[PDB]
């Protein structure tokens, strides 16, 4: 059920983010403070103490003063607070004060889901975005070889029967990606695909 920090760190190193990755974290991820460098991270919405709820990806682009928040569901800030109790202003504030000369940044976030409502692949979609990020940090959400393979649909449509095929097709290809790109995936494919299944939530 879900995906573990060990398994996403493995998959993220396999994707080439080794030189830029800051580890997976609970909601208390300190941010990007170490220095002004291409850095990205995977961040849970809850604390470690909850045993884990939802995976997000974060990236900092030094060339463009931009932090990307990636939720495979593409929820709004409000909907992030609401459903997951997750906020990340503390984290952005620490990152701006540290790296931004003018204490300002661009926060760029998804407005669409690539994830089915009952899928438990969030962690993995995060991996995928991070690959895209670490290769195309200027254009990571869309318009690059990696994210091109996914098909965004408006987050407002997450629960609608019209886009289920679409979010499923998204999962199958994600699996193909990670298959093609990650030795740690191929070695534990059968398992990760069972634990992260397109409708894991129905079969708990």
């Amino acid at each position: 059920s879900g995906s573990s920090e060990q398994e996403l760190a493995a998959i993220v190193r396999d994707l080439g983010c080794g030189p830029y990755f800051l580890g997976t974290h609970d909601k208390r991820f300190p941010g990007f403070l170490a220095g002004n460098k291409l850095a990205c991270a995977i961040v849970n919405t809850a604390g470690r103490e909850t045993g884990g709820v939802h995976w997000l990806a974060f990236g900092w682009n030094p060339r463009s003063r931009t932090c990307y928040m990636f939720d495979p569901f593409g929820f709004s800030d409000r909907r992030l607070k609401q459903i997951y109790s997750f906020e990340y202003e503390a984290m952005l504030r620490r990152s701006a004060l540290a790296l931004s000369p003018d204490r300002c940044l661009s926060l760029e976030q998804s407005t669409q889901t690539v994830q089915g409502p009952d899928s438990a692949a969030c962690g993995l979609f995060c991996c995928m975005f991070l690959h895209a990020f670490v290769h195309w940090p200027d254009r990571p959400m869309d318009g690059n070889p990696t994210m091109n393979l996914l098909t965004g649909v408006p987050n407002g449509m997450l629960q609608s029967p019209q886009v289920l095929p679409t979010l499923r097709r998204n999962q199958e290809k994600l699996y193909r990606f990670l298959a093609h790109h990650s030795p740690y995936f191929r070695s534990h494919r059968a398992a990760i695909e069972h634990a992260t299944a397109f409708d894991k939530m129905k079969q708990l």
Binding site: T66, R93, Q109, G152
Partner: peptide, 11 residues
């Protein structure tokens, strides 16, 4: 990929 939204955020 996904559409997205970019806000300037000052601290």
């Amino acid at each position: 990929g996904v559409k997205s939204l970019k806000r300037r955020r000052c601290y």
